[PDB]
Amino acid sequence: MSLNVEAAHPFIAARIHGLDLSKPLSDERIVEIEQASGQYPVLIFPRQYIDDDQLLAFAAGFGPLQVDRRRMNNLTSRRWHSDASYLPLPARYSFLLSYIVPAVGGQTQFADMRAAYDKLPDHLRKVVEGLSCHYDIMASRAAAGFYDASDEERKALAPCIHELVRTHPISGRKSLYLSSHATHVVGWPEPEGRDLLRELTEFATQPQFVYSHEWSVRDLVMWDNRALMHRGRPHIPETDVREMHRATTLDDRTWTRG
Amino acid sequence: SLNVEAAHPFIAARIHGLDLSKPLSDERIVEIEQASGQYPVLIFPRQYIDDDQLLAFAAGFGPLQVAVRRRMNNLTSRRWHSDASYLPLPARYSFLLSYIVPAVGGQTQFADMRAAYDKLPDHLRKVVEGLSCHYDIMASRAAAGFYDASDEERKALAPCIHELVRTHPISGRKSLYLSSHATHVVGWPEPEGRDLLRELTEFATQPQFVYSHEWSVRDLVMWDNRALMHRGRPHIPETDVREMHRATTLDDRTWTR
Numbered sequence: 001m002s003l004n005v006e007a008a009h010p011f012i013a014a015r016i017h018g019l020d021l022s023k024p025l026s027d028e029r030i031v032e033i034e035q036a037s038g039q040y041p042v043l044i045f046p047r048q049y050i051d052d053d054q055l056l057a058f059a060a061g062f063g064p065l066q067v068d069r070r071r072m073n074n075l076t077s078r079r080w081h082s083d084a085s086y087l088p089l090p091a092r093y094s095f096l097l098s099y100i101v102p103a104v105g106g107q108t109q110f111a112d113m114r115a116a117y118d119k120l121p122d123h124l125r126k127v128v129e130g131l132s133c134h135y136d137i138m139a140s141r142a143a144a145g146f147y148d149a150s151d152e153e154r155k156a157l158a159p160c161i162h163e164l165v166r167t168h169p170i171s172g173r174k175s176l177y178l179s180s181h182a183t184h185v186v187g188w189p190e191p192e193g194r195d196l197l198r199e200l201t202e203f204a205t206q207p208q209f210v211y212s213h214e215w216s217v218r219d220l221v222m223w224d225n226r227a228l229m230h231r232g233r234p235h236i237p238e239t240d241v242r243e244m245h246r247a248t249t250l251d252d253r254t255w256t257r258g
Numbered sequence: 259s260l261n262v263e264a265a266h267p268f269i270a271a272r273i274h275g276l277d278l279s280k281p282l283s284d285e286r287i288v289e290i291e292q293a294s295g296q297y298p299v300l301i302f303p304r305q306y307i308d309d310d311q312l313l314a315f316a317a318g319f320g321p322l323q324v325a326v327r328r329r330m331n332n333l334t335s336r337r338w339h340s341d342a343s344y345l346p347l348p349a350r351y352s353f354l355l356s357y358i359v360p361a362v363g364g365q366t367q368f369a370d371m372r373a374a375y376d377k378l379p380d381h382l383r384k385v386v387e388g389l390s391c392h393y394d395i396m397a398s399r400a401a402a403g404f405y406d407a408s409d410e411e412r413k414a415l416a417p418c419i420h421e422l423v424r425t426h427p428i429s430g431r432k433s434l435y436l437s438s439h440a441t442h443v444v445g446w447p448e449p450e451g452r453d454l455l456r457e458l459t460e461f462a463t464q465p466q467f468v469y470s471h472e473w474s475v476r477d478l479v480m481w482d483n484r485a486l487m488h489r490g491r492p493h494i495p496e497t498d499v500r501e502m503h504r505a506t507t508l509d510d511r512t513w514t515r
């Protein structure tokens with residue numbers, strides 16, 4: 001590892017200095033970043049004054065790009081979730097580049113699902129092994145108070161199923177596939193499934209599993225949805241402007257770099 | 259005078275040396291009521307009293323709630339709530355007398371809604387003052403995955419409204435009326451109301467506001483629903499025996515001793 005890696009948290013997040021992401025990275029550098037993400041699933045590249053084309057070009061090195069509603073997305077993102085876990089093909093890495101940072105609040109917080117899995121009480125460890133869960137965007141929106149959706153969107157975003165205990169392809173780490181999108185456990189009565197997910201979510205978002213990112217202008221933050229949940233925090237006052245540019249890659253295990 | 263021993267600096271205290279098998283004097287009931295103004299959780303150790311004596315003790319503090327599902331109650335009790343907040347006339351004090359205590363887990367946890375109100379960030383303090391919330395047992399049961407209810411029960415337990423900021427009649431303390439039964443804010447769009455209650459509930463149940471009661475056999479725990487949320491914790495294994503006898507008084511402010 002020749003990358004200049006500086007831990008921002010002992011195991012969730014790290015800064016990577018000395019990169020100019022306005023230029024395409026070499027293949028060896030992209031691999032190094034992937035390896036660094038296996039240790040720290042949140043990577044912060046400070047002071048990246050890049051435009052959207054360059055942001056998208058950087059993101060596209062790690063997977064295929066994902067191809068009112070501002071109010072809805074703002075409020076639902078305040079709940080712990082993993083990006084696009086409600087899709088059969090969820091997100092791989094997500095990317096957020098800050099343009100304008102509010103003075104108070106507005107953190108993005110990250111919860112380590114590997115650490116949460118590792119620290120589970122023995123009886124919960126035994127219970128989660130081999131389970132699968134239902135993931136349902138319309139149910140999670142309804143829980144946040146949003147009930148309006150076209151029949152086309154409901155069909156296009158029909159609920160799916162994912163295994164609860166994941167194994168990361170880079171690091172081999174086991175982790176919990178928690179998300180606000182997960183409703184209950186496949187093959188279990190709904191109440192017992194909801195209660196298990198309630199208990200796991202409270203456990204996995206205790207402070208020892210959480211890194212709270214205090215944003216700086218032009219931070220590029222890249223996070224691995226395969227190992228995390230994340231959420232946005234309100235900024236105070238809400239009238240302050242907060243401008244973030246986003247890109248998302250999909251976890252297509254058949255995709256290959258060039 | 260009352261022998262009060264704090265179990266937590268401001269949430270809970272033990273009261274020693276009382277024999278609750280016999281009726282208490284009026285002066286003694288006033289002493290307990292006033293002490294509950296300081297400590298909303300009161301613990302009476304080693305109360306070997308039968309159900310009649312437990313009910314008579316509870317009846318000194320308000321009128322008893324009459325009844326009108328073990329799986330459902332077991333799972334919903336693990337969520338933070340305030341007893342009978344889904345009724346237009348909610349609970350005053352609840353009472354729990356332990357008979358059989360499991361070795362691992364099974365704590366009852368209590369979150370001080372007065373302390374939570376006191377510590378609110380200024381911007382949240384300003385927002386909550388005049389608010390009201392909808393309280394809806396069928397919605398909270400559905401949120402836990404329970405959808406079966408007769409049309410008769412749905413009518414008998416129809417949603418109601420309570421103020422978000424309470425003022426306690428004994429202590430004058432302000433507190434947040436949080437509960438799993440509360441769905442959203444009256445007169446607000448649902449998403450903004452749900453999000454406020456989410457933020458408040460997370461803030462109000464952080465560890466600095468919580469007392470976790472480790473049960474002892476024949477503990478009689480009396481707690482003031484007007485100032486708290488509470489929840490049960492699973493015991494491990496769930497097959498271990500756990501026996502608790504319960505009584506509930508209603509916050510009927512037309513009632514007098």
Ligand SMILES: [Fe+2]
Binds near residue numbers: 077081082083
């Ligand atoms: Fe997100």
Ligand SMILES: [Fe+2]
Binds near residue numbers: 335339341
């Ligand atoms: Fe209760």
